[model samples]
Target: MGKVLLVISTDTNIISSVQERAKHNYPGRYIRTATSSQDIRDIIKSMKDNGKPLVVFVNGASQNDVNEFQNEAKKEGVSYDVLKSTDPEELTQRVREFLKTAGSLEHHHHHH
Candidate 1:
């Protein structure tokens, strides 16, 4: 993944820390956030519509919203995941790992 949109909620507290780790761990790969607002939601929709992958981390949002976006991502051929968690540390760690190894697994395939 060249860049990943970390779509999250403003009511959450992990954005600052996760973004910090993103820069230190994966330079040149732009990691950004979009709050769960109507405008931001439209932007995320358009991004995925244009074939951009996202690393959606849902915290303050409901499962229905996250699941809807997750399903949309699947239909769009986006190579990533929608990781939902309430624990800030765990979410941050997951984002860190993904940034460090961006697209590594998705780029690999097997033949048997």
Candidate 2:
């Protein structure tokens, strides 16, 4: 199985929900948490070094935060896709798709 990384926005109720669903659906998958844009960048770099495809899930974060992260990712030359939805199942599916397409296992990384 390949590695999957979930980059969360920050500490919030929505992030809590994402964490719960990820734990339930992806047992034993690599899980990581990040609270800031810099954290996200570091996680991305680590994942890249491991040659792992990543799926980033952004919750109720400010647009500025999201944009900053996106910009940083571009600067790092890392490829990523965004999965957005209020539905947990959809979010789960997005994650699954990313992992499946990348042929990797689910992994979560946190930068707090």
Candidate 3:
């Protein structure tokens, strides 16, 4: 309900290991998985309803699929992030820093 980490990958092993690592590293945070673009959209909508920050890690998925997710997340106003590092140790470290400022970025009010 607070923060959600949604991991999407066509490869089960990839997602499993990432989810396992994330779950272990960040306990009590909502972690989820999605294999398809539609699934990601649905999950994003639900996460948006929670009124919390949503971080999405896409690995082993097609660029088209990634585009779909990004478009959907942008439309829904949920936070979306891609895993840039392929190495495990670096990825974990990046995610550690990534999560620190996940929800706080890009939150601005318009002055008219």
Candidate 4:
């Protein structure tokens, strides 16, 4: 099984809070961030080449970018899921849920 990737949109504050919560809730799960679409493409490319599973957490205000990311991932043949939420707790819960269902199950470990 591959690692879990957390892709965030704009708002580093939100990303930082979520990352801190994730670190506490899901130790060893890989977390990353990107402020722009180009950065997201680069990060996803790197992770996909390594066969990592991706859980994208798009800010509530970034629906358009999230859609673009979904399309881009499809074109690149990389698996990814989008999360939309502004509340940190909700974001955390959704990420955890996505990881439970979508990540690293066969490896005997959880990612979210």
Please list the C-alpha lDDT of all candidates, in the order they appear.
0.50, 0.55, 0.57, 0.57
TM-score of model 3 relative to the true fold?
Answer: 0.62
lDDT of candidate 1 over 8-108, digit per residue (tens): 54446665666566566655234544445442355445544333333544545565665555555455444445454555567667776665565443432
- Looking at model 4, which ten-residue stretch has the lowest summed lDDT? 103-112
Over 14-105, each residue of candidate 2 has an lDDT whose tens digit, in order, gives: 55666667667664234455456766667656654455655555545455666676666666554565544555455566666655677653
Off by over 4 Å in 1: 1-11, 20-29, 34-54, 59-62, 103-112
- Per-residue alpha-carbon lDDT of candidate 4 for residues 37-85, written as tens digits (9 for 90 to 100): 8766775566545564555444343556666666666666556655544
Residue 66, candidate 3: Cα error in Å is 1.1
Better of 2 and 3 by lDDT: 3
TM-score between model 2 and native: 0.63
Instruction: State each candidate's clash count.
Output: 0, 14, 0, 0
* Clash pairs, model 3 backbone: none
Q: Write the per-residue lDDT of candidate 3 for residues 1-112, one digit (tens) a residue.
A: 2344444445555555666686687753545555578777777667555554545566444677677776776776555556544455555555556567564545343221
